[PDB]
Design a protein around this ligand. Structure first.
Ligand code: IYI
Ligand code: CA
Length: 293
């Protein structure tokens, strides 16, 4: 069955006065592969992708500030906060050139960093990524009223912070196959205390949809503009019906973005790594062998 364990030794690095945890496996030389998770996950989401790549490539998978095994300071956990911390993480590890493997809010981080530092990004593998969604009619019908409620400070915080609905409900509803109790406990662990749930609520409130919030929409449009021109090698994974990326949008993107290969993973919602890790990991490994890295 799909693996439930997380066998990786913990590594920690001080970043802007805070400790961040990261996975670091694979050979020491060569261009490293930097895996960035999103909401509400951690490096745990990459646990069955990394073993396909770690035979021949260094794999680095941080836990975002406020998440996983990373420290959880009293921040607002705005996207800008995550940018500051991941900028500093990459610099703290002394990374030069990288290949990005990114998902959900990790893709916004990876795309925004790559747009700012294109000489250092030798390829981008991405899936269920942050795009400027033009209308709420593009959001999956079965989840529409709830995600609109999440974007308030009263019902939204009751649901996500007080009642933990993003972990107990939204997370399983973003995976086609059923998550085991062991897997659910791995996702629950960073967030046992309600006061640590701020990122879980701020991330859906940063989601750029129907023009709100305007500053995030502008930032995401900027990196999409870059992605539509840049020759950087691209690998897009998509599933059906998806959540952030409907299958029609994934097709359109695969045909419009330069130097892009697209892989249909089958059934999938948001956590594509939880529905077809074997294909995602094996296709990243094969694609990496075609890059000049
Ligand atoms: C076990 N089990 C399958 C479930 C399933 C459902 C529930 C529900 C429940 C949940 C929803 C609900 O979550 N609807 C929304 C689904 O959304 C799916 C698409 O997203 C997938 C992930 C996409 C992430 C994107 N990242 S991201 O946001 O940063 C950005 F920004 F997009 F990028 C809606 C209604 C209900 C309900 O039953 O009332 C509960 C509600 C309350 C509750 N109390 C204890 C009070 C417990 C619940 O127990 C459940 C367990
Ligand atoms: Ca080409």
């Amino acid at each position: 069955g799909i693996g439930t364990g997380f066998p990786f030794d913990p590594h920690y690095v001080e970043v802007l006065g805070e400790r961040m945890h990261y996975v670091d496996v694979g050979p020491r030389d060569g261009t490293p592969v930097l895996f960035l998770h999103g909401n509400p996950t951690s490096s745990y989401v990459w646990r069955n992708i990394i073993p396909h790549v770690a035979p021949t490539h260094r794999c680095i998978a941080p836990d975002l500030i406020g998440m996983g095994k990373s420290d959880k300071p009293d921040l607002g956990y705005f996207f800008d906060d995550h940018v500051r911390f991941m900028d500093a993480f990459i610099e703290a590890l002394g990374l030069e050139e990288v290949v990005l493997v990114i998902h959900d809010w990790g893709s916004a981080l990876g795309f925004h960093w790559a747009k700012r530092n294109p000489e250092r990004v030798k390829g981008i593998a991405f899936m269920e990524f942050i795009r400027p969604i033009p209308t709420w009619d593009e959001w999956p019908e079965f989840a529409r009223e709830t995600f609109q409620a999440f974007r308030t400070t009263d019902v939204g915080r009751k649901l996500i912070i007080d009642q933990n609905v993003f972990i107990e409900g939204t997370l399983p509803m973003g995976v086609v196959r059923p998550l085991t109790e062991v897997e659910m406990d791995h996702y629950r662990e960073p967030f046992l205390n309600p006061v640590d749930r701020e990122p879980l609520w701020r991330f859906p409130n940063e989601l750029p949809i129907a023009g709100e919030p305007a500053n995030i929409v502008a930032l995401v449009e900027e990196y999409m503009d870059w992605l539509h021109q840049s020759p950087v090698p691209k690998l897009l994974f998509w599933g059906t019906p998806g959540v952030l990326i409907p299958p029609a949008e994934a097709a359109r993107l695969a045909k419009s973005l330069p130097n892009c290969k697209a892989v249909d993973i089958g059934p999938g919602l948001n956590l594509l790594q939880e529905d077809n890790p074997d294909l995602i990991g094996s296709e990243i490994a094969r694609w990496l062998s075609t890059l000049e890295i």
